[PDB]
CSV table of C-alpha atoms and ligand atoms in Angstrom, one decimal:
chain,number,residue,atom,x,y,z
C,3,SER,CA,94.8,-173.4,38.7
C,4,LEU,CA,96.0,-169.7,39.0
C,5,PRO,CA,95.7,-167.4,42.1
C,6,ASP,CA,92.5,-165.3,42.4
C,7,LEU,CA,92.3,-161.6,41.8
C,8,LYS,CA,93.0,-159.7,45.1
C,9,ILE,CA,91.6,-156.3,46.1
C,10,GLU,CA,93.1,-154.7,49.1
C,11,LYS,CA,92.7,-151.2,50.6
C,12,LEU,CA,96.0,-149.4,50.5
C,13,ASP,CA,94.9,-145.9,51.8
C,14,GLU,CA,91.8,-143.8,52.0
C,15,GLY,CA,90.2,-143.9,48.6
C,16,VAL,CA,92.9,-146.1,47.1
C,17,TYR,CA,92.9,-149.9,46.5
C,18,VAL,CA,95.5,-152.2,45.0
C,19,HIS,CA,94.3,-154.9,42.7
C,20,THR,CA,96.6,-157.8,42.1
C,21,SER,CA,96.2,-160.3,39.3
C,22,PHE,CA,98.4,-163.1,38.4
C,23,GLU,CA,100.1,-164.7,35.4
C,24,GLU,CA,102.7,-167.4,34.9
C,25,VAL,CA,105.6,-165.9,33.1
C,26,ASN,CA,108.2,-168.2,31.5
C,27,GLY,CA,111.3,-168.1,33.7
C,28,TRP,CA,109.8,-165.8,36.4
C,29,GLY,CA,107.2,-168.1,37.9
C,30,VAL,CA,103.8,-166.8,39.1
C,31,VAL,CA,104.1,-163.0,38.7
C,32,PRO,CA,101.8,-160.7,40.6
C,33,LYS,CA,100.7,-157.5,38.7
C,34,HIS,CA,99.6,-154.6,40.9
C,35,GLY,CA,97.4,-151.8,39.7
C,36,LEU,CA,95.1,-149.4,41.6
C,37,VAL,CA,91.5,-148.4,41.9
C,38,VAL,CA,91.2,-144.7,42.9
C,39,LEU,CA,87.8,-143.4,44.3
C,40,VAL,CA,86.9,-139.8,43.8
C,41,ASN,CA,83.7,-139.2,45.7
C,42,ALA,CA,81.6,-142.0,44.2
C,43,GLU,CA,83.6,-142.4,40.9
C,44,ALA,CA,86.1,-145.2,40.5
C,45,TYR,CA,89.2,-145.0,38.2
C,46,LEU,CA,91.2,-148.1,37.2
C,47,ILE,CA,94.9,-147.5,37.2
C,48,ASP,CA,95.9,-150.3,34.9
C,49,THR,CA,93.6,-153.2,34.0
C,50,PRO,CA,94.3,-156.8,35.1
C,51,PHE,CA,95.8,-159.1,32.6
C,52,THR,CA,92.4,-160.6,31.5
C,53,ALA,CA,88.9,-159.5,30.5
C,54,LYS,CA,87.5,-161.9,33.1
C,55,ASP,CA,89.6,-160.3,36.0
C,56,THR,CA,88.8,-156.8,34.7
C,57,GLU,CA,85.1,-157.7,35.0
C,58,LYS,CA,85.6,-159.1,38.5
C,59,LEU,CA,87.3,-155.9,39.5
C,60,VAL,CA,84.6,-153.6,38.0
C,61,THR,CA,81.8,-155.7,39.5
C,62,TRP,CA,83.4,-155.5,43.0
C,63,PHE,CA,83.3,-151.7,43.0
C,64,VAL,CA,79.9,-151.3,41.2
C,65,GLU,CA,78.3,-153.7,43.7
C,66,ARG,CA,79.5,-151.4,46.5
C,67,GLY,CA,78.0,-148.3,44.8
C,68,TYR,CA,80.8,-146.9,42.7
C,69,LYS,CA,80.5,-145.8,39.1
C,70,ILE,CA,83.5,-146.8,36.9
C,71,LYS,CA,84.4,-143.5,35.2
C,72,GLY,CA,87.5,-144.7,33.4
C,73,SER,CA,90.7,-146.7,33.2
C,74,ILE,CA,94.3,-145.4,32.4
C,75,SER,CA,96.9,-147.8,31.2
C,76,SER,CA,100.5,-147.1,32.2
C,77,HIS,CA,102.1,-148.8,29.2
C,78,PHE,CA,101.2,-150.9,26.2
C,79,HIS,CA,102.0,-154.4,27.6
C,80,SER,CA,99.1,-156.7,28.4
C,81,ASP,CA,99.7,-156.5,32.2
C,82,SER,CA,98.4,-152.8,31.9
C,83,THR,CA,96.0,-153.1,29.0
C,84,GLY,CA,94.6,-156.7,28.9
C,85,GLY,CA,91.1,-155.4,29.9
C,86,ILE,CA,90.8,-152.4,27.6
C,87,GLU,CA,88.7,-154.3,25.0
C,88,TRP,CA,86.2,-155.5,27.7
C,89,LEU,CA,85.9,-152.0,29.2
C,90,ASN,CA,85.3,-150.5,25.7
C,91,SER,CA,82.6,-153.2,25.2
C,92,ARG,CA,80.8,-151.8,28.3
C,93,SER,CA,81.2,-148.1,27.2
C,94,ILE,CA,83.6,-147.5,30.1
C,95,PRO,CA,86.1,-144.7,29.0
C,96,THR,CA,89.6,-146.1,28.5
C,97,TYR,CA,92.7,-143.8,28.4
C,98,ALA,CA,96.3,-144.2,27.3
C,99,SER,CA,98.9,-141.8,26.1
C,100,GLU,CA,99.2,-141.2,22.3
C,101,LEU,CA,102.5,-143.2,22.3
C,102,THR,CA,100.9,-146.1,24.3
C,103,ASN,CA,98.0,-146.2,21.7
C,104,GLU,CA,100.6,-146.3,18.8
C,105,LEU,CA,102.4,-149.2,20.4
C,106,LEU,CA,99.1,-151.0,21.1
C,107,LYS,CA,98.3,-150.7,17.4
C,108,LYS,CA,101.8,-151.9,16.4
C,109,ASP,CA,101.3,-154.9,18.8
C,110,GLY,CA,97.9,-155.7,17.2
C,111,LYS,CA,95.9,-154.8,20.3
C,112,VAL,CA,92.7,-152.9,20.9
C,113,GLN,CA,93.4,-149.2,21.6
C,114,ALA,CA,92.1,-147.0,24.4
C,115,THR,CA,89.2,-144.9,23.3
C,116,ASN,CA,90.8,-141.7,24.7
C,117,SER,CA,94.4,-140.4,24.3
C,118,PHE,CA,96.5,-137.6,25.7
C,119,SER,CA,99.7,-135.9,24.5
C,120,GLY,CA,102.4,-134.2,26.5
C,121,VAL,CA,104.4,-134.9,29.6
C,122,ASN,CA,101.8,-134.0,32.4
C,123,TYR,CA,98.1,-134.9,32.1
C,124,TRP,CA,95.3,-134.6,34.6
C,125,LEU,CA,93.0,-137.6,34.4
C,126,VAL,CA,91.1,-136.0,37.3
C,127,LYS,CA,92.1,-132.4,38.2
C,128,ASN,CA,93.8,-132.3,41.6
C,129,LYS,CA,93.3,-136.0,42.1
C,130,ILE,CA,95.0,-138.3,39.4
C,131,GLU,CA,97.9,-137.0,37.5
C,132,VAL,CA,99.8,-138.9,34.7
C,133,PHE,CA,103.5,-138.2,34.2
C,134,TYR,CA,105.8,-139.3,31.4
C,135,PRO,CA,109.4,-139.6,32.8
C,136,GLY,CA,111.0,-140.7,29.5
C,137,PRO,CA,111.6,-144.1,28.0
C,138,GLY,CA,112.6,-147.0,30.3
C,139,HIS,CA,110.9,-150.4,30.6
C,140,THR,CA,109.1,-149.4,27.4
C,141,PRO,CA,109.2,-146.2,25.3
C,142,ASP,CA,105.7,-145.2,26.4
C,143,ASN,CA,105.8,-145.9,30.2
C,144,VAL,CA,104.0,-143.4,32.4
C,145,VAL,CA,103.5,-143.1,36.1
C,146,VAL,CA,100.3,-142.1,38.0
C,147,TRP,CA,100.5,-139.6,40.9
C,148,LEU,CA,97.8,-139.1,43.5
C,149,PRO,CA,98.6,-135.7,45.1
C,150,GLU,CA,96.2,-136.0,48.1
C,151,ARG,CA,97.7,-139.2,49.5
C,152,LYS,CA,101.3,-138.8,48.0
C,153,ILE,CA,100.9,-142.2,46.2
C,154,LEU,CA,103.0,-142.9,43.1
C,155,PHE,CA,101.9,-145.8,40.9
C,156,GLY,CA,105.2,-146.6,39.1
C,157,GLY,CA,103.9,-149.4,36.9
C,158,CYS,CA,106.6,-151.4,35.2
C,159,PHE,CA,109.1,-148.5,35.2
C,160,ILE,CA,109.8,-148.9,38.9
C,161,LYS,CA,112.2,-151.8,39.1
C,162,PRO,CA,114.1,-151.6,42.4
C,163,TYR,CA,115.8,-155.1,42.3
C,164,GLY,CA,116.1,-155.9,38.6
C,165,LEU,CA,114.8,-154.5,35.3
C,166,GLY,CA,113.0,-157.6,33.9
C,167,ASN,CA,112.8,-158.3,30.2
C,168,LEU,CA,114.6,-155.5,28.1
C,169,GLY,CA,113.0,-156.6,24.9
C,170,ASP,CA,111.0,-153.5,24.6
C,171,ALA,CA,113.2,-151.3,26.9
C,172,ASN,CA,115.2,-148.2,26.1
C,173,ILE,CA,118.2,-149.1,28.3
C,174,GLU,CA,120.2,-146.1,27.0
C,175,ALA,CA,117.5,-143.7,28.2
C,176,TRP,CA,116.3,-145.4,31.3
C,177,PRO,CA,118.9,-143.9,33.7
C,178,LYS,CA,118.1,-140.3,32.5
C,179,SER,CA,114.3,-141.1,32.8
C,180,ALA,CA,114.8,-142.5,36.3
C,181,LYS,CA,116.8,-139.5,37.5
C,182,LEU,CA,114.0,-137.2,36.3
C,183,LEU,CA,111.3,-139.3,38.1
C,184,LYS,CA,113.5,-139.4,41.3
C,185,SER,CA,113.9,-135.6,41.1
C,186,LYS,CA,110.1,-135.1,40.8
C,187,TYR,CA,108.6,-137.5,43.3
C,188,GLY,CA,111.0,-137.5,46.3
C,189,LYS,CA,107.9,-136.6,48.4
C,190,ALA,CA,106.1,-139.9,47.7
C,191,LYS,CA,104.8,-141.7,50.8
C,192,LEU,CA,104.0,-144.9,48.9
C,193,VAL,CA,105.5,-146.1,45.6
C,194,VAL,CA,103.6,-149.0,44.0
C,195,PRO,CA,105.6,-151.1,41.5
C,196,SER,CA,103.8,-153.5,39.1
C,197,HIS,CA,105.6,-156.6,40.2
C,198,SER,CA,106.9,-156.2,43.7
C,199,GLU,CA,105.8,-154.9,47.1
C,200,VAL,CA,104.8,-151.4,47.9
C,201,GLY,CA,107.6,-149.2,49.3
C,202,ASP,CA,108.5,-145.6,49.8
C,203,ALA,CA,110.4,-143.0,47.8
C,204,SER,CA,113.6,-145.0,48.2
C,205,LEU,CA,112.3,-147.2,45.3
C,206,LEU,CA,113.0,-144.3,43.0
C,207,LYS,CA,116.8,-144.3,43.9
C,208,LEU,CA,116.9,-148.2,43.7
C,209,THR,CA,115.3,-148.0,40.2
C,210,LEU,CA,117.9,-145.5,39.1
C,211,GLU,CA,120.7,-147.8,40.4
C,212,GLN,CA,119.2,-150.7,38.5
C,213,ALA,CA,118.9,-148.7,35.3
C,214,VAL,CA,122.5,-147.6,35.5
C,215,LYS,CA,123.7,-151.2,36.0
C,216,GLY,CA,121.4,-152.4,33.2
C,217,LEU,CA,122.9,-149.9,30.8
C,218,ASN,CA,126.4,-151.0,31.8
C,219,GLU,CA,125.5,-154.7,31.3
C,220,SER,CA,124.1,-153.8,27.8
C,221,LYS,CA,127.6,-152.7,26.7
C,222,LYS,CA,129.2,-156.1,27.4
C,223,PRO,CA,129.4,-158.6,24.5
Q,301,ZN,ZN1,105.7,-154.3,30.6
Q,302,ZN,ZN1,105.0,-155.4,33.9
């Protein structure tokens, strides 16, 4: 009564996990995150929505011989953070920016056990980089960059065709943030949005255009 968790190889050492929720007005919405393999260590880039799918995901990798070293959540909404509590319960390190952890707390959610400040953060040196482009979809949204394969996980900041719900957005800042992100990751081979298909670096430009339009629409009565 709700489509099963998918796990699909995207590139060498990189898998996309897709979990599903019904969202009022939007239908059955896929949520994409990654699993990144560094030698025999696995890192979750976003959790699924639920504890149950987070556990399915972890078990798939552990069964195949990988050690779950950590998760990083790209923003505070539950499509990035739903599994943090379960991971914490299993003593799997969970990561989020300081600002994401603040907004988890404000939202009455379980926090990541580890936090980081600043604009650039290496989760794994030379392998998994976290970048804060500025506010957009949410105040805290970050992207995750995999330098070896030139893969950008955009999370819910990358919105090539429409912005989604602006309830927690900073629409005034989003164009400036999008310009920064576009300027920094023109090199991306694959850009992975949360809620639409994988594309290339062109999704950075499309997101900027959407942000610009959305800011314009915000200024109409
Ligand atoms: Zn969100
Ligand atoms: Zn989302």
